[PDB]
């Protein structure tokens, strides 16, 4: 999913 994990 886009944006989930670099948060």
């Amino acid at each position: 999913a886009v944006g989930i994990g670099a948060v």
């Epitope: 999913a1 886009v2 944006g3 989930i4 994990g5 670099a6 948060v7």
Partner: antibody
Framework: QVQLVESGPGLVRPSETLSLTCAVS?????????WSWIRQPPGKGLEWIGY????????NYNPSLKNRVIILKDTSLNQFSLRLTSVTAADTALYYC??????????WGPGFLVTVSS | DVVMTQSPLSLSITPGQPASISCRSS???????????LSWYQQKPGQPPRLLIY???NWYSGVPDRFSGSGTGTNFTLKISRVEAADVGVYYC?????????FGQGTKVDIKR
């Protein structure tokens, strides 16, 4: 209506650099999406290579690639491209360009077969 | 990496019967936003995978209800309730919450006839 197409060479010499370009139509590259490259050696599993963001956040790549991967995006041409340096026979595979979106990988390209041979 | 393990690696389905693939992760796929980011893809030969399920039980647009996903935490299960002939191919589970992104090795589905 979103379609992605990979283009480039089908043959690259070893130790050289593999360049692949994914052209996106049906949506602007400057959206809330991670434009990603994933490879699959024929008849085997999927290896996630990495992504470049449609926003301003930095790209992230797979540590298994040993700092050989650069993923770039070009808004003016509405495309994104993969550069993979110092290729070996292990890098011979099918390369898919995809869009990781608000759901998950929404759309995949048909796949492009790159063979590393002299 | 978050290691994804599928079981079984080769699954022959019997007509008129249901079929079940399991996918287990080395870490929880629960994100801080409360959602679970697990996805199921189907890959027929010579073409890219198709997105079937994201968010273990939500169906992607155009995917039939006969494909179903269940599970919590590290245990996930994809069931094909009543198969079609077209449904042969390789099925993958993938987590979209942890970096690097990871997929299962894939379960090859062939039909009995």
């Amino acid at each position: 209506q979103v379609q992605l197409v990979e283009s480039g060479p089908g043959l690259v010499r070893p130790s050289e650099t593999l360049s692949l370009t994914c052209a996106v139509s049906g949506a602007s590259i400057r959206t809330k999406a991670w434009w990603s490259w994933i490879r699959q050696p024929p008849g085997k599993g999927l290896e996630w290579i990495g992504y470049v963001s449609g926003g301003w956040d930095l790209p992230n790549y797979n540590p298994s690639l040993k700092n050989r991967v650069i993923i770039l995006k070009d808004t003016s041409l509405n495309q994104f491209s993969l550069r993979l340096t110092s290729v070996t026979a292990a890098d011979t595979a099918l390369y898919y360009c995809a869009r990781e979106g608000p759901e998950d990988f929404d759309v995949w390209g048909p796949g492009f077969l790159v063979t590393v041979s002299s | 990496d978050v290691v994804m393990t599928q079981s079984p690696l080769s699954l022959s389905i019997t007509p008129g019967q249901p079929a079940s693939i399991s996918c287990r992760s080395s870490q929880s796929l629960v994100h801080s936003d409360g959602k679970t980011y697990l996805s199921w893809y189907q890959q027929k030969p010579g073409q890219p995978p198709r997105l079937l399920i994201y968010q273990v039980s939500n169906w992607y647009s155009g995917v039939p209800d006969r494909f179903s996903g269940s599970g919590t935490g590290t245990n996930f299960t994809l069931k094909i309730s009543r198969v079609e002939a077209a449904d042969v191919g390789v099925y993958y589970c993938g987590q979209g919450v942890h970096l690097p992104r990871t997929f299962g090795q894939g379960t090859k589905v062939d039909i009995k006839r």
